[PDB]
Each structure stands twice: as structure tokens, then as C-alpha cells.
């Protein structure tokens, strides 16, 4: 009776064959047939999948060689000019947008902005619009959402066309450089009649239904963007187009309830995963006959769901709008999970049994549909209960250690024994630094040897001295080539770790890793994010080994480099019963003993990076943002508050400024007004020039103070111009010191 449904599934392939053949196809070592091909045999083995789980609403439409919201946009035919000049076939239009082009003497296009989506870890491709831009449909470059549908309808799978909604579409997107002036959403009136459009030619397919996606809905949108909801819907809404199902996810669309109470959809669709809260109140706008997807097995972790609490939440939905009318939903795209348990080799069984990954979660949403049909599920019932006991009543997941020091949290654990004015003094008198001291922000270009060596160690076919060895050398290259440079503070090269975040997760309790566990990130390019399963300490030194042999070669002050505890929790996937906040202040405290053993080892100059911050922000102003920035920055002082005033903590950012404030940083490279009450100091970040180099700072000295810069590059290209490069700044940075 109550329908099952999927917002997306997963297109990479159960063994990244999305990716193996998308990047044959860039490298040339296959043809474009060979690219069409695959795509359509991993389409075809998804939707059967769908159609094998028994789920009742299965998507068509989410595939994508790239990104869907750049399918959209050559769909629409927003495509800047720039990309059209090569004759390219629209496939490999898609692909200039999306991955730039390069070709003979000479073109350089940039690709579109990477952007990511809501607080989600995928990545979007911007849609970029220009005073100039025609939207229209082409039908030459095949219709895809058309082609589809009937591709998966010939299979025998009635499927539900997914397409990114007028506004949201619009409102995610951007003004190209020629068109400074441009507000997207200002262009609505042009580019509905093209989804009008879709819309009936998808209808004359066969479709019946499409899910229609409006997540901007759950951002702090202005009034006069919240009109469009209606302007939009009541345009697109006919007989001779499917029904639609405007649908969110993410968050709470309760703050523009009243942007989409007299809308002429079928349905809607909210995630009751984030946000279980605003059932009510959803629930209680629905107009006769509009029906209600209950967003309620998690499309962005990993857990295995509660079947009887998901069950309760949809009974809810059912109480108030009546079962003939509220369908059992995936709360998001499964886009943001791993394709499937299964493949994992490794997990032990105990573990496994907490986890659902896209595959496993089809099967999750049929067994809360059939319960709440009033079908005997009570065997699937009972093994889940079972489950979700088990992981209950499991240690693994509490350790009375870190729950006791958890209590010791207070504010003297979380601020420094100084303030910053008096911490510089002690480290003048201990580093006694020059003006405008030069440094470098993250690794260099590491030799084929290291791979070797890495992968031969891992075989045990080189013992650990001998890869050790091999690392040291390379550390020793590293150093030995910033002091020919002449650099004041140095880095080691970080040769032995493959990933910011896996190498720490690998050496703290309370974590699990998987073999297969693959999600995209952006185009090509996947992560395989470890699980936060329990609580997190550290056993021992992490990084000390490698920073006390670099230190050990100069008499330069070396950085020691870590990954902040936000960043650790951001990308991983975090435990489910317990708050982000809690992973977040043990992972704090798990760095705190790291940056101590650092600085009694001698490495008294520290750099913790926190890369994920702006990307974990709560999509709403309000008390949960204003909280979230509160909680990490209270993390990285945590981690980095244990030091001496002598002891230098510096941190690096590719923002808002009063946050940045507020970790209390000695240092912090960046890529200035409020800056100017700052005590701390800042460094501020083709080929460029002693005299190229002379301006910038010459400009920059007319605001901050001298007393206050450090010179370093944007952020972590070869070492040809890795040397000419730095040793122009290095040589620039000294001629602004013979001025003093
Ligand atoms: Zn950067």
C-alpha cells in the first residue's frame, strides 16, 4: 500500500568503473563509444538493482559522466561562449565546462567554479549565466532526462525523471565576468519555458511523475526570492506536463512554509533525517490530494537505519495526512554514500552489522514501507532490533577514559597561559625571527621513489629502517633545498602521508576504514571517508618521528603540520548517536597530546589546519551557526591551548574574520580592515618577480603594519618554478628588510 521511493542512487560503480572509463575517455585510450557504452550498462545495472529491492519510485536522471547540475546547464544551454570555439561535440562541451581545455599554440580555459553543494562533501559544477545567455533545449546533443526515462522504460523500469527546479537552479548559480550587474534569479521568466518544455516531452515519454528538486528552499532565502516558488510552479503545472514532487532535503524549510503553501505540485518531499521536527508543520500545509514523502533512511551516512524509530516518524506523517497519500523515502540523494557493504573485504562481522551503505539501504526503505502497510515484516523487524542492540550495547563505542576527560573541559583547557601580545614577546626572545619572515605553507613535489618505496613497504619487501630511511632522505631534499633558498621557517614535506585525514584517523582509536567505501567528491575524483565508530583518543605519537629528524638537520625552526579535529570529524563520516560537537572536542583533545608531545620533542613551531570549516556552517543563521562556530573553534583551542607562550601555533586558510579571531592563532596565512585591531599576526599569500613581489607588499604596508607580516605563497606546479618562485619572494621579503 505505502510506496517505497530513491532520490538517487550512487552512479560510480560498485568498482569505480565510472571513473575508470570516464578518465580513459580524457587520456584517449578509449572512444566515445566505449564511454556511451559503459554509462549505459551501469544505468541498467542500477535501475535493476532498484527494481530487484522492490522499490516502488526509482530514479532516472541522477547518472552523470561529471555533474548533474552542469548536465542541467548544457541541457539549458548555459554555456559560455569561450566554450564553444573548438568544435568540440556537445559531450566534450560538457567536459570543457566542467574540466577546462587545454590545446596546441596556445588555450588555457579555465573550467567553471567548483561550488560545493549545501553542506553536503560533493561538489557542483556553477552554472554561470551572462546578460547574453538563450536558454533553450538541444535536441541534436540528445535530450538526456528524455533518453533516459525510455532507456530504463525498454528495460522494463518505469522510473521518476529527477531535475534541479527553476529556482533553485537560478539562485545556485552565478553572474559570468561579463555580466557583473546580472541577479540569476532575475532571469526566471526566460528559462521556464524551457523546463516547460522538458517537462512535455517527458510527459509524451511516458513519464508520469517527476521529482522535482528545490533544496535551496532550506536556505535563509530573501522575500522576493521566495515569491518565485509560486511564479514558477503555477507556469509549469498543466495537463500536457507529469506530475511534479517538489522536493528538499538537508534541512528546514519552516522559515519559507509560506513560499510554497498555494503551490499546483503533486507533492513534496522533506528530509526528516535532519529534521524530524518539522513534520507538523509541513504535514499541516498540504492541500487536498498533494502527497508526502518522508525522507527517512539517511542519504549521507552509513548507519545502519532504526527500522522501528524511521517506522514511527513515517506513522506520523501517515496520522496526519493519511496512507493512501505519504510515501517512504530515501532523505536525500544516496549520491553521498558508498555504493555497497558487500564489497568491504576487512570490516569484522561485528562492525558490519552497523552499517548500511546505498545498496543495503534499498532494502531498508521497502521493510519500513511494508511495516507500515500493516505487511508481517516482523522477521526483518526483529534482526534489525537486534542490530541496532548490539551496536547499543557494544564498548567499543564508550571508553571511560575519554568520558572522564571530557568533564575537564573548561575555558583555561581551551585558552593559551597568555595573550597573544605577551606570547610575542617570549617568542622574539626565542626565535628572534626578522621582519617579514618567510615560510611556506603546506608540501612540495614528491619523487616516484616514494610510491615505489611506500608500496614495497606495505609488502614488507623493504624493512620499516629501510623505508625509513628512504623518507628521511627525501625530508633531508626538502630542508636542504629551503636553506639554499634562504627561508626562515621550514617545513619537512609530509613524504610519509598519503591523505590529511586518513593518516591521523589511522592511528586513533575509534575509528574504522573500509576497503570499497567510495563516494564522489567532484567529476572524477572520489574519497573513501573513514568512520568515526566510537570514542576517539590518541595511543601515541603521530607525526613526531618524521618532524624531530627534520628539526634535527637545521638549526631553522621546523613546523610541525597537523589536521584540526573539525576537519578530522568533516571528513569522515561521523557516529550518529552521538552529537558533532562531542566527536568534535574528543578529537580536540586527541590533538592536544599530539601538539605536546610536538613541542617536548622540540618542534615548538606548529601548524593545524582546518580546511573543513566554512563547509560544515549550518545552512540558517541562528543558534545552531552561532553554536557550530563557537564548538570549533573551542576544538582547535583545545588541541592547541596545552603550549607554552614561547610556542608558536600558526594555521592556514583558503572566510569570517571574528571566527578566525577567535583560535587565537599566533600566526595565520591567508589568501584586513577588521584585521587592524589584531594583535596576532597574519601572512599574507605567472611567475613572479622580486619587483612583482615588491608591490604587493609595498601596497599591503599602507594598511597592516610591518611588525605584523609574514611572506609565504597562496597555498601548498614543479621545481623549476617552485625555486625561482620562492627564491624571488625570499629575495623580495629581504629587500623590504634593508628598508629597516
Ligand atoms: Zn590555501
Known sequence: MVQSSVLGFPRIGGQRELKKITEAYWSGKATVEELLAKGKEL??????????????????????????????????????????????????????????LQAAAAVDVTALEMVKWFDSNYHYVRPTFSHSTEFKLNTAAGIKPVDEFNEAKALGVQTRPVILGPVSYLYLGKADKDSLDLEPISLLPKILPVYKELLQKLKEAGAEQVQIDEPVLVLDLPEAVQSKFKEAYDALVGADVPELILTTYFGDVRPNLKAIENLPVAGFHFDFVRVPEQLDEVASILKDGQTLSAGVVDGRNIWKTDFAKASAVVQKAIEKVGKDKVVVATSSSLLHTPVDLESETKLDAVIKDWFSFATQKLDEVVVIAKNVSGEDVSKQLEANAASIKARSESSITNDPKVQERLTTINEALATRKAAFPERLTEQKAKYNLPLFPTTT????????????????????????????????????????????????????????????VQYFGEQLNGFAFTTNGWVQSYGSRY????????????????????????????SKPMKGMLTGPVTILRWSFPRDDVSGKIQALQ???????????????????????????????????????????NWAAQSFRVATSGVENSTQIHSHFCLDPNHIKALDADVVSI???????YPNHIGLGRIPSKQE????????????PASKFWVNPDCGRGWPEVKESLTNMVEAAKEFRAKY
Do not use: C
Open 43 to 100: 544505468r541498467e545495472h542500477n535501475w535493476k538493482l532498484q527494481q530487484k529491492a522492490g522499490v516502488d519510485i526509482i530514479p532516472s536522471n541522477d547518472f552523470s559522466y561529471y555533474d548533474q547540475v552542469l548536465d542541467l546547464s548544457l541541457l539549458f544551454n548555459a554555456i559560455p561562449e569561450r566554450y564553444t570555439k573548438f568544435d568540440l561535440a556537445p559531450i566534450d562541451v560538457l567536459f570543457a565546462m566542467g574540466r577546462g
Open 441 to 500: 605553507i603546506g608540501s612540495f613535489p614528491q619523487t616516484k621513489d616514494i610510491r615505489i618505496n611506500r608500496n614495497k613497504f606495505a609488502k614488507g619487501q623493504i624493512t620499516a629502517e629501510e623505508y625509513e630511511a628512504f623518507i628521511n632522505k627525501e625530508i633531508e631534499t626538502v630542508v636542504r633545498f629551503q636553506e639554499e633558498i634562504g627561508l626562515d621557517v621550514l617545513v619537512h614535506g609530509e613524504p610519509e602521508r598519503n591523505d590529511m
Open 527 to 554: 574519497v573513501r571517508p573513514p568512520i568515526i565508530v566510537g570514542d576517539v583518543s590518541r595511543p601515541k605519537a603521530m607525526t613526531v618521528k618524521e618532524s624531530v629528524y627534520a628539526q634535527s638537520i637545521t
Open 587 to 629: 578529537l580536540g583533545l586527541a590533538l592536544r597530546d599530539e601538539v605536546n608531545d610536538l613541542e617536548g620533542a622540540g618542534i615548538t613551531v606548529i601548524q593545524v589546519d582546518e580546511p573543513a570549516i566554512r563547509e560544515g556552517l549550518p545552512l540558517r543563521a541562528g543558534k545552531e551557526r552561532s553554536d557550530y562556530l
Open 671 to 677: 589568501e584586513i580592515q577588521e584585521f587592524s585591531e
Open 693 to 704: 613581489f615588491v608591490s604587493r607588499i609595498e601596497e599591503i604596508l599602507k594598511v597592516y
